[PDB]
């Protein structure tokens, strides 16, 4: 065999400890470049001008940040959506000042994470599996595309993307509330129902299986040694759990088919996260949540406040205080 | 009203910075992660026990064999992610431990919030920021938002206090 | 502000940048404020004021026609912002103007459709490969491929 | 920055004490059989 086919056999080899594949050919250099640049920038990057008003923000540990406050701060507002690679700056000092590392990290990461999803189909095709595991991973992937790419596109600047830091994330959540009222949007509400129910259904499925484990052990050893890897028989009684959970509610409110059950376990959080991912994407074009401000008035015309108006006072507090120097005109249109 | 409760804890308690809510966040989202990835792993490692394209009916509750291959699913995740489960009993218990432990930690978090024992500030950050007017972090920017939340919603959210705030004392940025 | 006698060309903003006019990162004179991110915009109501080095300050002081002032005020008060129940303005605005931009409908409605169709690609492409290969219904117990492979470790 | 003076030894013992507790259990387990 010649060399090109020997290389193709190694890339798609099902015997590597870590599968490479053709999607992995792109994922490895892009994920490494984004990882190496992130760890360095999180430790020693100088302050960068996030809002383009010559007001640099510190983000690295060596400049007075802890794990909770540290972040890689997005690119300057004067850059907007312009492509800002290293070779466009007159020096690395200007590159570090204008938030260069942020664009380099999110671009190599998004391209790498997309290939991570395609790498999930590839190995499943080589092993004889069903291919839809990567479809489940598309929901957290689409969540990354929204707060890193789609929302900057709609607003017109990467400075409004989510920062790469713990405290920086909380900043992205509060400002997004004041400008889009995300809590009152039915897509974030579906996303909350996806993660709450996801945690509910995770604890439910885990408790019911563990509760109907068939006995293979004594008490002086763990119950996990009753199941051993590769055995053909099922390690828990599926019928004992159905009649248990059936009588807790009613019989037909419980799954007797395991395949139908595990399909439900995958469909609820994925479809819920798909919506909240699109909630961020649709709000990138400023189709915000439900506005019921001053929606109830009495017979004379006085405004009878509701809980929606109390929310509006909290949003106005975040509105007037966020980016306290980047506004010279009464309306914040982006 | 629950949404107001969410914003009240951010403005007055800075509940997002509390490390106990962070552990509770990991439990809920970590629980949603395991719920999605376990259901997708089972549905994509099934055995062919029927002949119809909709594989739901190739399973009998009476059956003694496992409906999906634990061996194949283990090798898939070992090569994709690095590690993988290899024992069903430990897997399903882990699916109980993660979301339950998360919620218990968040319960401890707000028990301290009943006594206003908040995780509101970093002392070292505040002391040098008070004497260095050019020291700005994402953490100091959030506290300015909380100072806006408190001053703008208090007279309406707490009418019993009879809060009267003139226009000239309301903290506001430029133009807005 | 210029009608009231303000020299917009020399007006200094609180951040040090020009209150009304600043420079793009490549030198072009542009508008100040957060709209510095939108200096790539081109529009018929705006181009008559732009010269070789960007917005011409002396064209600004002398060549602003009343139809440009009306078009600017019209487009200012019709920004593509609005609630889902069609209340124009930012999220903090009160009920009055019943409006949402047709650009906001068409952009959001076609991103939701574009996303789900990519999911449709991932679904219908992965299955077509499995169906053509023969294992679209699951693993054959008598011929499991993983069992015929060496151990990873 | 003016941090807590004992945050160093508090973090050092937060890691060291439960780590060697698990190391002690694992090494004695592998040494059985």
């Amino acid at each position: 065999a010649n060399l090109w086919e020997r290389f193709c056999n190694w890339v798609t080899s099902t015997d590597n400890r870590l599968y490479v594949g053709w999607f992995g050919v792109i994922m490895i250099p892009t994920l490494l470049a984004a990882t190496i640049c992130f760890v360095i920038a999180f430790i020693a990057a100088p302050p960068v001008d996030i809002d383009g008003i010559r007001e640099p923000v510190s983000g690295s540990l060596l400049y007075g940040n802890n794990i909770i406050t540290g972040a890689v701060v997005p690119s300057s507002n004067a850059i907007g959506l312009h492509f800002y690679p290293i070779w466009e700056a007159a020096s690395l000092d200007e590159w570090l000042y204008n938030g260069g590392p942020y664009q380099l990290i999110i671009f190599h990461f998004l391209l790498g994470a997309s290939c991570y999803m395609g790498r999930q189909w590839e190995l499943s095709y080589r092993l004889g599996m069903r291919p839809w595991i990567c479809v489940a991973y598309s929901a957290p992937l689409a969540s990354a595309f929204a707060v890193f790419l789609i929302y900057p596109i709609g607003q017109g600047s990467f400075s409004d993307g989510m920062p790469l830091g713990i405290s920086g994330t909380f900043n992205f959540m509060i400002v997004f509330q004041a400008e889009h009222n995300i809590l009152m949007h039915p897509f974030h509400q579906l996303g909350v129902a996806g993660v709450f129910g996801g945690a509910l259904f995770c604890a439910m499925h885990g408790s019911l299986v563990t509760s109907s484990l068939i006995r293979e052990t004594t008490e002086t050893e763990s119950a996990n040694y009753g199941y051993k890897f590769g055995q053909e028989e099922e390690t828990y009684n599926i019928v004992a759990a159905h009649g248990y959970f059936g009588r807790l509610i009613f019989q037909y409110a419980s799954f007797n088919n395991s395949r139908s059950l595990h399909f439900f376990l995958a469909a609820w959080p994925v479809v819920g996260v798909w919506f909240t991912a699109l909630g961020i994407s649709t709000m990138a074009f400023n189709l915000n949540g439900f506005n019921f401000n001053h929606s109830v008035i009495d017979a004379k015309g006085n405004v009878i406040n509701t809980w929606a108006d109390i929310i509006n006072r909290a949003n106005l507090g975040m509105e007037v205080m966020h980016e306290r120097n980047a506004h010279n005109f009464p309306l914040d249109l982006a | 009203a629950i949404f107001r409760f969410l914003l009240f804890f951010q403005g007055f308690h800075n509940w997002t910075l509390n490390p106990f809510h962070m552990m509770g966040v990991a439990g809920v989202l970590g629980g949603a992660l395991l719920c999605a990835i376990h259901g997708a792993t089972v549905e994509n490692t099934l055995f062919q026990d029927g002949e119809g394209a909709s594989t739901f009916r190739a399973f009998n509750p009476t059956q003694a064999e496992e409906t999906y291959s634990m061996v194949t699913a283990n090798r898939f995740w070992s090569q994709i992610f690095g590690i993988a489960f290899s024992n069903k009993r430990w897997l399903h218990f882990f699916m109980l431990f993660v979301p339950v432990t998360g919620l218990w930690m968040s319960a401890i978090g707000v028990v301290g919030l009943a006594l206003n024992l908040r995780s509101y500030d970093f002392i070292s950050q505040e002391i040098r920021a008070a004497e260095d007017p050019e020291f700005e972090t994402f953490y100091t920017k959030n506290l300015l938002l909380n100072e806006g939340i408190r001053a703008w919603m208090a007279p309406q959210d707490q009418p019993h206090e009879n809060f009267v705030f003139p226009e000239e004392v309301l903290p506001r940025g430029n133009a807005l | 502000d210029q009608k009231l006698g303000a020299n917009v060309g020399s007006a200094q903003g609180p951040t040090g940048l020009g209150k009304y006019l600043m420079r793009s990162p490549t030198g072009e004179i542009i508008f100040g404020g957060e709209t510095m991110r939108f200096w790539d915009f081109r529009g018929p109501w705006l181009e008559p004021l732009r010269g070789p080095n960007g917005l011409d300050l002396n064209k600004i002081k002398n060549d602003i026609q009343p139809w440009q002032e009306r078009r600017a005020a019209e487009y200012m008060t019709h920004a593509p912002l609005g609630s889902l129940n069609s209340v124009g303005g930012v999220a903090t605005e009160i009920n009055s103007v019943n409006f949402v931009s047709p650009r906001s409908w068409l952009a959001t409605s076609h991103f939701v459709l574009a996303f789900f169709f990519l999911v449709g690609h991932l679904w219908h492409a992965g299955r077509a490969r499995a169906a053509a290969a023969g294992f679209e219904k699951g693993i054959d117990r008598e011929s499991e491929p993983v069992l015929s492979m060496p151990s990873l470790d | 920055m003016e941090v807590n003076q004992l945050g160093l030894i508090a973090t050092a013992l937060f890691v060291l004490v439960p780590s060697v507790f698990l190391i002690i259990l694992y090494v004695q387990t592998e040494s059985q059989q």
Partner: peptide
């Protein structure tokens, strides 16, 4: 001291990744 403390803890976690992946307890079929 803080930065060295944080970087040290982070380095140990990355070091734990290498051992948990390549020196794991080998999956075994009976």
């Amino acid at each position: 001291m803080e930065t060295i403390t944080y970087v040290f803890i982070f380095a140990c976690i990355i070091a734990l990744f290498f051992f948990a992946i390549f020196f794991r307890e080998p999956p075994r079929i009976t």
